[PDB]
Amino acid sequence: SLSTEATAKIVSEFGRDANDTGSTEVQVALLTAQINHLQGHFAEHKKDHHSRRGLLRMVSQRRKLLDYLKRKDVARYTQLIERLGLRR
Amino acid sequence: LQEKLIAVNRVSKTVKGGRIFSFTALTVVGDGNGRVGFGYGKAREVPAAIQKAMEKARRNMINVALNNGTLQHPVKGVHTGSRVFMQPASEGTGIIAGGAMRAVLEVAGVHNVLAKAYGSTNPINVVRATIDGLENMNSPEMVAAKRGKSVEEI
Amino acid sequence: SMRDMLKAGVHFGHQTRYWNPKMKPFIFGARNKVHIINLEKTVPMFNEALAELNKIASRKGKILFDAALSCDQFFVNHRWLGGMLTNWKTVRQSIKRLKDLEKLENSLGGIKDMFVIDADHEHIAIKEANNLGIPVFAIVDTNSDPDGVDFVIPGNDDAIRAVTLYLGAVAATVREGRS
Amino acid sequence: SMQDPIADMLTRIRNGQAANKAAVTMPSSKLKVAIANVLKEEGFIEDFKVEGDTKPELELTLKYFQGKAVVESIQRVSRPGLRIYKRKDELPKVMAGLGIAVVSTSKGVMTDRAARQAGLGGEIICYVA
RNA sequence: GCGGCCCCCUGGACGAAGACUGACGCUCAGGUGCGAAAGCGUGGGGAGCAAACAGGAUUAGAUACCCUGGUAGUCCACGCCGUAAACGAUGUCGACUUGGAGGUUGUGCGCGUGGCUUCCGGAGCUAACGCGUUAAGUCGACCGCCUGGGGAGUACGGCCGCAAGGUUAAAACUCAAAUGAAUUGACGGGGGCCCGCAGUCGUCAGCUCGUGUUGUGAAAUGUUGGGUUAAGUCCCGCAACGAGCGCAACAUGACGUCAA
RNA sequence: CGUAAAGCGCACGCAGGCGGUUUGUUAAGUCAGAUGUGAAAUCCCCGGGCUCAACCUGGGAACUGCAUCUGAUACUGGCAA
Numbered sequence A: 001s002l003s004t005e006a007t008a009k010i011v012s013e014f015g016r017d018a019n020d021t022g023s024t025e026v027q028v029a030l031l032t033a034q035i036n037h038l039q040g041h042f043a044e045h046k047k048d049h050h051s052r053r054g055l056l057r058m059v060s061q062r063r064k065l066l067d068y069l070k071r072k073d074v075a076r077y078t079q080l081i082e083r084l085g086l087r088r
Numbered sequence B: 001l002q003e004k005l006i007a008v009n010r011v012s013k014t015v016k017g018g019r020i021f022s023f024t025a026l027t028v029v030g031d032g033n034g035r036v037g038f039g040y041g042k043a044r045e046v047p048a049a050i051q052k053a054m055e056k057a058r059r060n061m062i063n064v065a066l067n068n069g070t071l072q073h074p075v076k077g078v079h080t081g082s083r084v085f086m087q088p089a090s091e092g093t094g095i096i097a098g099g100a101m102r103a104v105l106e107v108a109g110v111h112n113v114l115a116k117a118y119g120s121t122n123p124i125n126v127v128r129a130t131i132d133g134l135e136n137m138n139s140p141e142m143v144a145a146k147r148g149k150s151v152e153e154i
Numbered sequence C: 001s002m003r004d005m006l007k008a009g010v011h012f013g014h015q016t017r018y019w020n021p022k023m024k025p026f027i028f029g030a031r032n033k034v035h036i037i038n039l040e041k042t043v044p045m046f047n048e049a050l051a052e053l054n055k056i057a058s059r060k061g062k063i064l065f066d067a068a069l070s071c072d073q074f075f076v077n078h079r080w081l082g083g084m085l086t087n088w089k090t091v092r093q094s095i096k097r098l099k100d101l102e103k104l105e106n107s108l109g110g111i112k113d114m115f116v117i118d119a120d121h122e123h124i125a126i127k128e129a130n131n132l133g134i135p136v137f138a139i140v141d142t143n144s145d146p147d148g149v150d151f152v153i154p155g156n157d158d159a160i161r162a163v164t165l166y167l168g169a170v171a172a173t174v175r176e177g178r179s
Numbered sequence D: 001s002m003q004d005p006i007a008d009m010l011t012r013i014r015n016g017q018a019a020n021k022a023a024v025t026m027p028s029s030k031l032k033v034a035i036a037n038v039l040k041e042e043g044f045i046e047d048f049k050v051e052g053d054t055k056p057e058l059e060l061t062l063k064y065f066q067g068k069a070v071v072e073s074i075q076r077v078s079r080p081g082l083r084i085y086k087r088k089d090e091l092p093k094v095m096a097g098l099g100i101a102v103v104s105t106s107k108g109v110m111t112d113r114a115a116r117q118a119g120l121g122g123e124i125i126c127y128v129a
Numbered sequence E: 001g002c003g004g005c006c007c008c009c010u011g012g013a014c015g016a017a018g019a020c021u022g023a024c025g026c027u028c029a030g031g032u033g034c035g036a037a038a039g040c041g042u043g044g045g046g047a048g049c050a051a052a053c054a055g056g057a058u059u060a061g062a063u064a065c066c067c068u069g070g071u072a073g074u075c076c077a078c079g080c081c082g083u084a085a086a087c088g089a090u091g092u093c094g095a096c097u098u099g100g101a102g103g104u105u106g107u108g109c110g111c112g113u114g115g116c117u118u119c120c121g122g123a124g125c126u127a128a129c130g131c132g133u134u135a136a137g138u139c140g141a142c143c144g145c146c147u148g149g150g151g152a153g154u155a156c157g158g159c160c161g162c163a164a165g166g167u168u169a170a171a172a173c174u175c176a177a178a179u180g181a182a183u184u185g186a187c188g189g190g191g192g193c194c195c196g197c198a199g200u201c202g203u204c205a206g207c208u209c210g211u212g213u214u215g216u217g218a219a220a221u222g223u224u225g226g227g228u229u230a231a232g233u234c235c236c237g238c239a240a241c242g243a244g245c246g247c248a249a250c251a252u253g254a255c256g257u258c259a260a
Numbered sequence F: 001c002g003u004a005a006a007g008c009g010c011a012c013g014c015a016g017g018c019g020g021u022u023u024g025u026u027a028a029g030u031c032a033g034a035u036g037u038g039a040a041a042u043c044c045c046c047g048g049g050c051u052c053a054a055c056c057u058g059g060g061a062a063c064u065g066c067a068u069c070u071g072a073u074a075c076u077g078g079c080a081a
Ligand SMILES: CN(C)[C@@H]1C(O)=C(C(N)=O)C(=O)[C@@]2(O)C(O)=C3C(=O)c4c(O)cccc4[C@@](C)(O)[C@H]3C[C@@H]12
Pocket: E156, E169, E170, E171
C-alpha cells in the first residue's frame, strides 16, 4: 500500500488542509497514486489475480467518485482530471 | 347440537400377516348459533369411528361472533396446505362453499357466506382452516374494546 | 410479608444458564451465575394467589396439592400418573381397587376419597389442569415456563424451607376461609 | 440498502407486538410522525414521542388489551417498487371498516374514513387492523 | 481454492480513538473478469502414483473388483478449455425479532464491548424433515430461475472452442402419472442382544383393545427403557392408566400366515 | 425456487429499477372539481307493447376511457440549498 509520507503529501496538494482526508479530490488522488504504483507490480506479476481484484476495486471506486464530482461540480472535476492526467 | 359427517376414509397399516384396515371419521357439531367444533375418530369399524369423532367434536367447540347468520368481515384461514377465504353475503345467498367448508359453516349457524378453498382441499385440513378463520374473526365490539373507542367511532 | 420470605430463601433462583427467558420480569439480578428473584413481585402475586384460593374453597372447593391433611385436602406426592385428571374415568378404577382391599397408596392415597410445587417438574399435571380448565397455582422458579400457570408465584421451590412457607400459607388461608 | 423507511416502521411495530415489547424506537421522520399520529388517534398505539434534533428518534408505546397485541395486522401497501394511489370512490375498506387504511392526501396523512369524508383520494400507505 | 521454513512484491479484513467528505448508495439484463479436476497446444520435467495397455488370478463368463507391471497424465512455463453433487443443493443488500453452550480474533475498565465462526434450541415458519438473530422468522430493493414425467439440456440455427466440446434452446410424439417428506411392515452379504440337537410357522412369546395423551395425518404411546426370567416372567422407572387373548396355574397350540 | 420443477460456479459493472434526512420551490406523477367527448344497437334498471314468453320498445343508468381548463400539495419525481 501507499506509504504514510506519500499519502500525507497527496492530502496536502489536493485537500483544503492536512485534516481534509475525506474530499473527493483527495480520495481520487490517493486511488490514482496507488493504481499508478501497482502498474509495476502487475507488469512483473501478471498472474497475481487475487491482488488484481483489489486494483480493479480501486479503479471502480475512482470511477464512482469522479462521476459524483462531475455532476456535483464540473469545474472541480475538470481541474482534477487535468492535474492527475486522467481521460475522464 | 346439529351433527354432520364430512368424510369417512379407510386407512391401512401393514403387519407380518398382511394389512390391517381401519376407518377414520371426520365430523363437525354445532349449535347453529356461533358455536362449532370438529372431531376426528379412528376405529376398526365405521360406526365406532363416527361415535368417537362425535364425542371429540362436542368437547372441542369454539365460539364464533356471528352477524345475522353471516360473517363480520372477509376472513382468511390456513392449515397445512389448505387456504380458505370466506366473505359476508346478503340474505338469500345461502352457503356458497365446498362440502367441507359448508358442513362447518352450516352447524356454526352461518346461513349466508361466499367461500373458496385454495391449495389442498383435503377435508381434515380444510375443516381446521375454516374453524381457524372463524375463531380469529373480530366483531365491532371487541375492536372498539381493544382500540379504546365506542362502536359508533369504529 | 417479605422479611420472612427471604428468611426462608425464596429469593434464590437457579444458575443463569438454566433460566427460562419468560421469567425475566420476576428476576431482580444475578450473583456468581445465580439469578435472584424479586420478592416485591412474589409478595403481591403470592398474597393474591391466597385470595383466589380463599374464594374457590369458600364454594366447597377441591384444592389438589402434611399441608393438605391440615386443610382437609388432597395431594399427589409421588409420581404424577399421566391422565390422573384427563383420564379420571379410568383412574377411578384404581381408586376402587385401592379401597376394595401399598403401590396404589403411594400413587393415589392422597386422592383416595377425591397447588403445584415446581411448574416445570409437574408439567404433565399443569397440562392436564389446562386441558380441563382447572386454575393452576404454581411456584415458578427461574428455570421454569409459567405459560400454563394461571396464578404464578415467582420464587424458589427446591429448598424444603421455602416450600414449608408456601404450603403453610395456603393450608392456613383456606382453612380459615372454610371456618 | 434501506430503501423503505415506512415499511421498516411497520415491521418494527409488527415485530415489537409479536415479541411483547412495551415500546419500539426508530430513526424519526416527518412522515413517520404523521403516520404515528394516525395510529395514536385511532387507538392502535398508546403514545409516541420524538427525542433528539440532529438525529431524532421516534418511540412508539405499543398497546395490549387482554394479553393480545392490538395491532393484529399491519401491512405496507404502496411501496417504492409499486406505488398505489386511489381516487376517493376507490379508497379501500380494511376488515369491512373495522380496520383502517392510512392515506396520504393533499390535506395530509389521514384514515380512509377521513379521506372519504373530505372527498380526497391519495396514496395508500398501509392497512392496519 | 490456499498448509515446511526464509526473503521480495502485493490484495483484503478487523479493532481503538478521533478528524474528514457529504447520499458519493443498493441491485444489475446485456458486457467483462476470475473459475476444481479431467482434457488440449508448444517447450521442459518425470521420483512416487496411475486411465490405456500387458500378464497373473477369480468366475459359468470377468473386456471388472484382487495381484505383478505400466504409458498418457499427475509436476514446471506460457496459452487454451469454462465445466463439477462448482453444495449450505439456500442470489445480493439493508432493517427488525426470546435464549443457552463453545471456538477464533481485537479492544475498555472478575466485569464489559466489537469482528468472524460452530453446536443446541424458543416464538414463528415449514408438506414434513427441519430452519431458528449466520432464518427456511417478520419486512423492503433489485436480479436470476420454475410451471407434470419423458422426448431433452436433445435437434435445428447462432455464437464460442485447435479439439474434446460448451453456451443459447425447441417440436412431433408418448404416459397418467413422475415426485417430495414422513408412517406401518418386510427385507439387508447393516448393528446390538438372545434362543432351539442349529396340518403348518410354533408351545414361538408373542398379539391386541378401551380411555387418555402426542402428531395436519398414515400412525405413535402403552408393549419402549434399567435389570431379571423358560416366559410381554417379574421388579423398578416411564404420558400413560387399565384390560383381553396368549405365559403360568387350575395334555393344553394366542392374534394370524400358506385362496395349504 | 434447502430436499417436490426452480438461486447463474463466483464476482465487477454500463443501461435499467430502487433511494437516508431537513427546508424552500415546482406541480410531472397523484388527488379534487368543472367542461367537452366517449355513435346507435347491445348489457343493466324502472316502465310500455305483442294473450304470455322469446321478441319489440320509452326513459334512465352505464360506457370504468380520453382530452382540456381550474384548483390541492401529503406522498413520489424535477430544481435549489
Ligand atoms: C416460432 N417460434 C419463433 C418458435 C420458438 O419460440 C422457439 C423457442 N425455443 O422458443 C424456437 O426454438 C423456434 O424459434 C425454432 O427455432 C424452431 C425450430 O428450430 C424447429 C426445428 O428446427 C424443427 C422442428 C420444429 C422447430 C420448432 C417448432 O421448435 C421451431 C419453433 C420456433
